[PDB]
Design a protein around this ligand. Structure first.
Ligand SMILES: Nc1ncnc2c1ncn2[C@@H]1O[C@H](COP(=O)(O)OP(=O)(O)OP(=O)(O)O)[C@@H](O)[C@H]1O
Ligand SMILES: Nc1ncnc2c1ncn2[C@@H]1O[C@H](COP(=O)(O)OP(=O)(O)OP(=O)(O)O)[C@@H](O)[C@H]1O
Ligand SMILES: [Mg+2]
Length: 521
């Protein structure tokens, strides 16, 4: 009955850790008056915002998230924003509470969010079982280290309804089994046609703005005595009953820009208040680019001997390393212009800092490792007689080590690096290829390591002893598809992506892992 104004600004956030938020001015016919509509924290559950274009769906979302942010710090509240419209939730990306920001085409990013949520819900259910509780409200009441509330904010659900099936199933899980774990879901939507019942029924609070066709309103909420006028912000908010309400604006302002300017100021203020509070981490993602300098410093946390860091795990964004103690040898398998020489550089850079006794470097055709020559540990090999000298010199040391081993108790690395296997078998005979193969099965435990790079066909072409010995090596770095090499039997599909310089596969023990290889320069 009482006339509702067209524009109202929300009250100032003046209650730390509030349990109720004024989101709009509602008509209360039972009193024939007006008062704030208070959304109950946790209890009122997930929020579904509906209405036609231009009637305040995204505006309501902004008022909610900014209100919650004023009461809780980024350690208590985490935002995951899915902006599947026209960047309506883009400003909120600067909120300290915003853990990550997702877009409609962020396919890799979204799939990793799903992985995180599945694990996070698992961990939370396991933390509850220890405290013998079933609610985060109970857990955070009996715990020293409290769990942060997670909110999945999704704008424009219309694109999920059709274009993204696998992602919708997860959203249904979040809405159905999320409240108890501390995970809540707020979403806007225009067309309510294909919103499944297990999602709609888990949207306890429904904020329904004006619809051009009254049919959609009847689908969301039941029959009502009152209807909403075509006024932006005007809505029927149903939880138990529908209350005619004018939703509050995100901030003060006589027009849109003035409001948006004040919103930006408020977010700067929250940034000042919560400055001493740690902000949530984003979903573990691989960097756009990766240099050896960056990889060595900010990623390699542990620099232990006998371990060779070769790249970043795609899934965990953590460095995978070669265990020289359990896998003394390694193959660099790849294709034309894929990253073979660069991987060799990574191994060499990982060496030279572990105090090797000697490093025999047999460069390839292009001479792309001539810069590593003349170093105080590297024996750059060009000629055939020079190679024979290094092998026989390595033979002497490894033989004495065998005599030092028999004498005393149960080694600094003696390393033989081959940038090109094709070039090796082009400047040597099948007899010397047997000598190298012999040293591998005789001195492997005495600190002798080999690293041979080359294209996939180079490892399967030969019938010689060296080829036979190399195809028994279980550890490898693949700068090629798993479906384009005959050395290792690895699971794959036709839909596996193509490899490009900067990526590859870390292979050991019959298992593999997509890795990001740093660029050495
Ligand atoms: N609670 C409100 N009070 C006053 N005006 C509002 C309110 N909500 C929205 N408006 C007005 O409506 C305009 C657009 O609203 P909004 O973009 O939030 O609707 P929408 O449904 O999210 O739009 P679309 O979905 O078509 O992108 C704003 O410029 C604003 O002036
Ligand atoms: N890890 C990497 N990240 C980014 N770019 C790379 C990486 N590795 C190689 N490249 C680029 O690939 C190009 C070819 O170098 P690369 O050593 O990878 O080829 P290759 O494996 O030696 O091929 P071939 O042995 O057939 O000559 C170089 O210009 C280099 O810039
Ligand atoms: Mg090369």
């Amino acid at each position: 009955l009482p006339p509702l104004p067209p524009r109202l600004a929300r009250p100032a956030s003046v209650t730390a850790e509030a349990n109720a938020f004024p989101i709009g001015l509602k008509d209360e016919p039972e009193l024939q008056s007006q008062s704030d509509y208070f959304y109950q924290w946790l209890e009122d559950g997930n929020i579904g915002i509906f209405g036609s274009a231009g009637y305040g769906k995204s505006t309501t979302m902004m008022t909610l998230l900014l209100s919650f942010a004023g009461a809780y710090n980024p350690a208590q509240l985490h935002y995951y924003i899915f902006d599947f419209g026209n960047s309506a939730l883009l400003p909120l990306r600067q909120l300290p509470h915003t853990a990550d920001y997702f877009r409609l085409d962020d396919e890799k990013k979204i799939e990793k969010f799903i992985k995180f949520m599945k694990e996070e819900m698992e961990q939370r259910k396991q933390r509850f079982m220890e405290k013998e509780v079933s609610t985060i409200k109970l857990y955070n009441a009996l715990s020293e280290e409290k769990l942060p509330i997670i909110i999945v904010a999704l704008d424009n659900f219309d694109v999920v309804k059709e274009e993204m099936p696998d992602f919708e199933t997860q959203l249904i899980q979040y809405a159905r089994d999320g409240q108890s774990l501390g995970i809540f879901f707020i979403m806007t939507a225009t067309r309510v046609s294909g919103i499944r019942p297990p999602l709609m029924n888990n949207l306890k609070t429904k904020i329904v703005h004006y619809f051009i066709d009254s049919s959609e309103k009847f689908s969301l909420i039941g029959r009502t005595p009152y209807d909403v006028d075509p006024i932006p912000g005007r809505a029927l908010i149903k939880k138990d009953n529908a209350a005619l309400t004018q939703i509050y604006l995100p901030a003060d302002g006589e027009d849109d820009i003035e409001v948006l300017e004040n919103v930006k100021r408020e977010m700067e203020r929250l940034k000042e208040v919560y400055q001493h509070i740690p902000k949530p981490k984003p979903i573990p993602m691989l960097p756009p680019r990766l240099s050896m300098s960056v990889f060595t410093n900010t990623y390699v946390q542990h620099r232990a001997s006998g371990f060779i860091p070769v790249g970043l795990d795609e899934q965990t964004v953590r460095p995978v390393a070669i265990n020289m103690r359990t896998d003394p040898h390694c193959l660099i398998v790849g294709q034309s212009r894929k990253g073979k020489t660069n991987v060799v550089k990574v191994i060499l850079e990982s060496l030279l800092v572990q105090e090797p006794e000697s490093i025999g470097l047999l460069d390839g055709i292009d001479r792309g490792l001539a810069g590593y020559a003349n170093r105080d540990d590297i024996t750059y090999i060009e000629a055939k007689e020079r190679l024979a000298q290094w092998l026989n010199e390595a033979d002497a040391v490894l033989q004495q080590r065998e005599r030092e081993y028999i004498q005393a108790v149960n080694w600094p690395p003696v390393v033989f690096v081959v940038d090109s296997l094709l070039r090796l078998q082009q400047e040597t005979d099948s007899i010397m290829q047997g000598r190298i193969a012999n040293m591998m099965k005789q001195y492997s435990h005495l600190g002798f390591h080999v690293f041979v790079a080359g294209n996939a066909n180079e490892f399967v072409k030969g019938f010689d002893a060296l080829t036979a010995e190399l195809k028994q090596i279980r550890q490898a770095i693949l700068v090629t598809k798993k479906s384009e090499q005959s050395l290792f039997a690895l699971p794959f599909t036709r839909n596996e992506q193509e490899i490009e310089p900067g990526f590859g596969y870390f292979v050991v023990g019959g298992k593999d892992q997509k890795i990001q290889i740093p660029k050495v320069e």
